[PDB]
Amino acid sequence: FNYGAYHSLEAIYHEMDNIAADFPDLARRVKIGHSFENRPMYVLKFSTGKGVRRPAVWLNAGIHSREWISQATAIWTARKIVSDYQRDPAITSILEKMDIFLLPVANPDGYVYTQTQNRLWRKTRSRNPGSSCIGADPNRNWNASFAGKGASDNPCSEVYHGPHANSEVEVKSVVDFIQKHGNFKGFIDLHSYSQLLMYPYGYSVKKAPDAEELDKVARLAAKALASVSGTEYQVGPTCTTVYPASGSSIDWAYDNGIKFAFTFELRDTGTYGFLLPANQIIPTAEETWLGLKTIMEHVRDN
Amino acid sequence: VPDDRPCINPGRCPLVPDATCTFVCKAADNDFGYECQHVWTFEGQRVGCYA
Numbered sequence: 199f200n201y202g203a204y205h206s207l208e209a210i211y212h213e214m215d216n217i218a219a220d221f222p223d224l225a226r227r228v229k230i231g232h233s234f235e236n237r238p239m240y241v242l243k244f245s246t247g248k249g250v251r252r253p254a255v256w257l258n259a260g261i262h263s264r265e266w267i268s269q270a271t272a273i274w275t276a277r278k279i280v281s282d283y284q285r286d287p288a289i290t291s292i293l294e295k296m297d298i299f300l301l302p303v304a305n306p307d308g309y310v311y312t313q314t315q316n317r318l319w320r321k322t323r324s325r326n327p328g329s330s331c332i333g334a335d336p337n338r339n340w341n342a343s344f345a346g347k348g349a350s351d352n353p354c355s356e357v358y359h360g361p362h363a364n365s366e367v368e369v370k371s372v373v374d375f376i377q378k379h380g381n382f383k384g385f386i387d388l389h390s391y392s393q394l395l396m397y398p399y400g401y402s403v404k405k406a407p408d409a410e411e412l413d414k415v416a417r418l419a420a421k422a423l424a425s426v427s428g429t430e431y432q433v434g435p436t437c438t439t440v441y442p443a444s445g446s447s448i449d450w451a452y453d454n455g456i457k458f459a460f461t462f463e464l465r466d467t468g469t470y471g472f473l474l475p476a477n478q479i480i481p482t483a484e485e486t487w488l489g490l491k492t493i494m495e496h497v498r499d500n
Numbered sequence: 501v502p503d504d505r506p507c508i509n510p511g512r513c514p515l516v517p518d519a520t521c522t523f524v525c526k527a528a529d530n531d532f533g534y535e536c537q538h539v540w541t542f543e544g545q546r547v548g549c550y551a
């Protein structure tokens with residue numbers, strides 16, 4: 199499995215199985231539901247212990263199918279975690295304190311579609327009654343000012359919110375798991391592109407109560423990320439740093455008690471856009487990992 | 501299959517602000533017999549609008 203190339207859904211799933219097989223005491227591949235077309239939603243859970251209130255961090259990727267660098271970064275990250283456990287003191291102490299749940303392909307149907315039919319497909323592949331247009335934006339489908347400014351009522355739009363919050367089974371699956379499991383302290387959502395590290399809110403200009411801390415943490419993480427190969431990120435709240443966006447995942451997370459809620463917009467800044475060449479996968483993943491560790495160290499320490 | 505035509509209620513295209521929106525349809529194996537979608541173009545090439 200060449201971590202420096204893009205892969206099919208089947209290959210990514212198989213490599214997650216391989217990772218859990220290599221490190222059975224640490225990593226287990228877990229089914230949390232299925233997609234609209236009945237593909238399994240697979241997460242890897244990395245854990246060194248169990249508790250009723252044991253804290254956990256959720257790492258989300260590939261909610262938008264065309265953003266190939268996200269799924270590719272995610273699967274590399276799974277391997278980095280098991281490779282570095284009990285070698286790097288940082289990821290070791292993090293995992294000794296909390297669980298990490300990782301969802302490399304949050305939108306499997308869209309992902310398959312980007313490889314079979316339309317490289318720029320973004321949405322789910324669910325049916326829209328009365329319309330020949332398919333799919334909803336899973337990152338406008340969460341119960342966070344759902345259908346507010348920052349989405350579309352039009353099933354044919356990239357940013358269609360769906361008929362109601364949690365209509366998309368892909369999203370409902372994650373929401374259900376997080377609500378039932380509890381004790382999530384971080385939620386980090388990997389997208390591309392633009393090189394931004396953002397925090398709530400997307401649905402409103404209002405300031406998050408924790409904005410000062412989150413901004414501080416984000417700037418530290420961006421500096422760590424830049425330490426590898428000088429990749430520069432901008433930092434700020436979603437609405438004013440990229441655009442208004444309602445019903446997004448991190449806003450839902452933050453409004454539901456998950457303090458450290460961040461979105462990464464990975465490489466690049468528009469030269470290749472969504473079609474980032476495979477030769478940037480490893481460089482992207484390595485730098486992003488320093489950013490992720492920085493956030494998770496702060497979670498560990500609060 | 502429906503004729504391709506200009507979009508209705510297109511919205512913005514934040515990543516490529518002056519991109520052109522077209523409602524584009526293609527025959528397909530489903531209940532309708534075709535699938536349509538908004539397609540955005542810049543200089544005649546397809547682009548995505550949101551990140």
Ligand SMILES: [Zn+2]
Nearest residue numbers: 262389390551
């Ligand atoms: Zn995205």
